[PDB]
Design a protein around this ligand. Structure first.
Ligand SMILES: *[C@@H]1O[C@H](CO)[C@@H](O[C@@H]2O[C@H](CO)[C@@H](O)[C@H](O)[C@H]2NC(C)=O)[C@H](O)[C@H]1NC(C)=O
Ligand SMILES: *[C@@H]1O[C@H](CO)[C@@H](O)[C@H](O)[C@H]1NC(C)=O
Lengths: 101, 66, 253, 101, 51, 51
């Protein structure tokens, strides 16, 4: 709860019924009819929670991101395949000329 | 002085029995092929007692390289 | 180590020491473990016994951790030893995966008491309250069917489940499984500055603390205008962050 | 080598093995304690993923107002310009000021 | 799958689970102090035992 | 995960185990002397059937 303001009965200014109603609500909380009316007009259905259902047969929505890090692996592998390819072509090129050959 | 918590001999301890059944059967078939090869030696050799002595002389030195 | 008893742990590494010494004997004992290393070697005095007491210790711990080695025997009498030891490895590790699943599937299922209705049935956890007064007499004067049954538990258990002081009730929670009932303000003062307590449940009552005047005093409406100003400009809620938070708890850590 | 020592540090973890398996004691025990390390990781990962798919602990993304203070993925909004709104505008609370932004 | 249904077994300790399971049966000497007590008590758990 | 949900959920043994899960349909002829017992019962185990 962020704020803590409240709803009241309210009177006009200087009305003498106000303290008679201030004695009224402050009686209603001990004998509990005020909180009983909070259970009167608020609960109508109730909510269920049950049955502990198993996560049957993991799909892409569950496990499918393991294929993405698999896809990240294959793309990085071809990029380092050409990375050492022209490296050895340079390691050849201390004996070799025209490194396209 | 317990109920159970963590998989004792009362739970899993029979796996050591079939482990114990394995080691005892292994030594019994160790001598089973030992005198077999001593008989496989005995086609050209003599009686397999002193041939098995060489097969036990080799166990004694523990660094054969021969 | 918790998913297995330490009686198993104290034998199984000794059993790995056990299967190391037994297989090392049979390897020296068997004639079918003496083939050619570097097999191009054209002679007879080159027979190998790569089994060492180092290696027989190594084949045990290497197979036990489900990894492999480079031992690979040839004699049947050395193969049955590793064969049953492979059947012992598969049990002790899959059982270790089973019981470590078992701790984490019952601890996540473990749900504590949450509401006042959740404490309505548990007579294992004892209610109690503060001294006879503000928190108590709400339960006695109530007609709520939940809270009436709470008063019946307190009726049977006078003489110290019902303590007479706040910090004594704080002390009774910290020792036993006691669940203290208290005004919801001073719970926020202790739970903030203990980090061993928690406000379980919501709010039962909704009464409030006020400034207060004598009867017919004309300062009352001037103070009624006062507090009702303090909530918009937020200095009232700022003082709720002044005198209440002092430490913070590692529940977020 | 520096590549192979890294290569033993992955294939042993991945329950596959390699061809590096040493003979000197100083490199055996490092391989030994890594092999005890790799069952405590994977089987607990198997245990915990078997612990999720049984007894599902439903959780909300935010729990407090401070948890919604950072998530601009989940949008606040409010009701029409009035009672709930003008509390945020007239506030000086550092959390709720960032909500108004 | 065996070691999880074996864990949740409660070899019933307090009367509250013993108040829930109507398969196993209660017991009291009839018209004793026990029937005197659980009738004249109003406790939530124990009233289910009297019912 | 399949074998730890199919073994927690025991088959229908008695009114205790049949009260917890609601996948198996409870049985009642509407407005009978049997239903008369369960609408006025005080044991919550029998009232969770009525709830
Ligand atoms: C939970 O933690 C508490 C506190 O560490 C344990 O409470 C103990 O309860 C017994 C019951 O009489 C006291 O004698 C001990 O003094 C308490 N411990 C301490 C440190 O004060 C409790 O056992 C723990 N476990 C459970 C299941 O509640
Ligand atoms: C409460 O927490 C503090 C700090 O974490 C700790 O020193 C103390 O031992 C805890 N109380 C108990 C009863 O363990």
């Amino acid at each position: 709860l962020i704020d803590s303001k409240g709803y009241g009965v309210g009177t006009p200014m200087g009305s003498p019924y106000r303290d008679k109603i201030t004695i009224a609500i402050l009686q209603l909380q001990e004998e509990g009819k005020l909180h009983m009316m909070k259970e009167k007009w608020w609960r109508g259905n109730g909510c269920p929670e049950e049955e502990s259902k198993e996560a049957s047969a993991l799909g892409v929505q569950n496990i499918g991101g393991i294929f993405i890090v698999l896809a990240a692996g294959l793309v990085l592998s071809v990029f380092v395949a050409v990375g050492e390819f022209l490296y050895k072509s340079k390691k050849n090129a201390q004996l070799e000329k025209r490194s396209f050959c | 002085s317990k109920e159970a918590s963590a998989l004792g001999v009362q739970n899993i301890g029979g796996i050591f029995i079939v482990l114990a059944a394995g080691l005892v059967l292994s030594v019994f078939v160790a001598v089973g092929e030992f005198l077999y090869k001593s008989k496989k030696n005995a086609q050209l050799e003599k009686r397999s007692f002193c041939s098995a002595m060489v097969e036990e002389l080799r166990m004694s030195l523990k660094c054969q390289r021969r | 180590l918790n998913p297995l008893s330490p009686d198993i742990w104290m034998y199984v590494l000794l059993a790995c020491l056990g299967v190391s010494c037994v297989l090392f004997v049979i390897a020296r004992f068997s004639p079918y473990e003496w083939y050619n290393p570097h097999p191009c070697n054209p002679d007879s005095d080159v027979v190998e016994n790569n089994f060492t007491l180092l290696n027989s210790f190594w084949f045990g711990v290497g197979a036990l951790m489900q990894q492999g080695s480079e031992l690979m025997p040839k004699a049947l009498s050395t193969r049955i030893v590793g064969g049953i030891w492979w059947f012992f490895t598969l049990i002790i590790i899959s059982s270790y995966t089973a019981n470590l699943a078992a701790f984490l599937t019952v601890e996540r299922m473990e749900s504590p008491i949450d509401s006042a209705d959740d404490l309505a049935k548990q007579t294992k956890i004892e209610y109690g309250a503060v001294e006879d007064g503000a928190t108590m007499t709400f339960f006695k004067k109530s007609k709520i069917s939940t809270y009436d049954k709470m008063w019946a538990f307190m009726s049977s258990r006078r003489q110290s489940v019902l303590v007479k002081s706040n910090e004594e009730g704080i002390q009774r929670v910290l020792t036993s499984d006691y669940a203290f009932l208290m005004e919801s303000t001073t719970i926020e003062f202790v739970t903030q500055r203990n980090c061993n307590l928690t406000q379980i449940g919501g709010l039962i009552d909704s009464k409030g603390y006020g400034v207060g005047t004598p009867m017919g005093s004309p300062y009352r409406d001037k103070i009624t205008i006062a507090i009702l100003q303090l909530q918009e400009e937020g200095k009232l809620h700022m003082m709720k962050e002044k005198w209440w938070r002092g430490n913070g708890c590692p529940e977020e850590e």
